[PDB]
Design a protein around this ligand. Structure first.
Ligand SMILES: CCCCCCCC
Ligand SMILES: CCCCCCCC
Ligand SMILES: CCCCCCCC
Ligand SMILES: CCCCCCCC
Length: 204
């Protein structure tokens, strides 16, 4: 599947575009590659996991998200648990440890590693043949002496996605995210970060 997404961030006063290609294999392997651009008025991420079928409803996915930026490489081993409660309702939970392969100045001025503990919760609800609603909730916290742009050692994200199944292989969507007070505009941080996004996913 190919996903193209454009987004506006209200606190950062910035536009971002994501181009993403993802595929599940019948042997259980799954992978994704994406690029994200950032235009104030950049990253590449590779994700791989393996789907362990516990039964017809339950799947465990050991995986890793590798994140490439100009600062360097960040490795995010994870485990995701997925439950298809019904054909129309799926729940998911993931814990990921984001470990930076590069050292950065911490809040005390010492060189350390800005590693992160990250949890995501997922609910996907196929409302009817036309629409699917998905919510992803996220909590991450710092392992070491660093902070987020909200002046805390932790922050949240909440992503709300409405997908319209126009075609069986074309799915336009709209999305609203609240990314905590993590907006940064001209060195000034602690801004409310609303995120408004529109995209479309294309199946083969
Ligand atoms: C899923 C990998 C677990 C890594 C946790 C490390 C905590 C210091
Ligand atoms: C068994 C996983 C529960 C997922 C919680 C959903 C939070 C949006
Ligand atoms: C179609 C009306 C029910 C949809 C609400 C469920 C959560 C988005
Ligand atoms: C079912 C949608 C949940 C919305 C949560 C909003 C949290 C402030």
């Amino acid at each position: 599947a190919l996903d193209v997404r454009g987004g506006y961030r209200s606190g950062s006063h910035a536009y971002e575009t994501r181009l993403k290609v993802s595929e599940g294999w019948q042997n259980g392997w799954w992978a994704s590659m994406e690029s994200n651009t950032w235009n104030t008025i950049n990253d590449v991420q590779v994700e791989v996991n393996y789907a362990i079928k516990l039964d017809d409803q339950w799947t465990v996915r050991p995986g890793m998200l590798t994140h490439f930026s100009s600062n360097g490489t960040r490795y995010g081993p994870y485990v995701k648990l997925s439950w298809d409660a019904t054909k129309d309702l799926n729940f998911g939970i993931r814990y990921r440890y984001d470990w930076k392969a590069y050292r950065q100045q911490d809040l005390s001025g010492d060189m350390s590693r800005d590693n992160v503990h990250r949890w995501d919760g997922y609910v996907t609800y196929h409302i009817n043949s036309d629409f699917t609603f998905a919510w992803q909730t996220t909590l991450y916290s710092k392992q070491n002496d660093y902070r987020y742009a909200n002046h805390k050692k932790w922050a949240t994200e909440n992503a709300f996605v409405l997908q319209y199944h126009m075609t069986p292989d074309i799915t336009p969507y709209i999305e609203y995210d609240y990314l905590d007070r993590q907006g940064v505009y001209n060195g000034r941080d602690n801004l409310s970060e609303n995120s408004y996004r529109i995209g479309v996913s294309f199946k083969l």
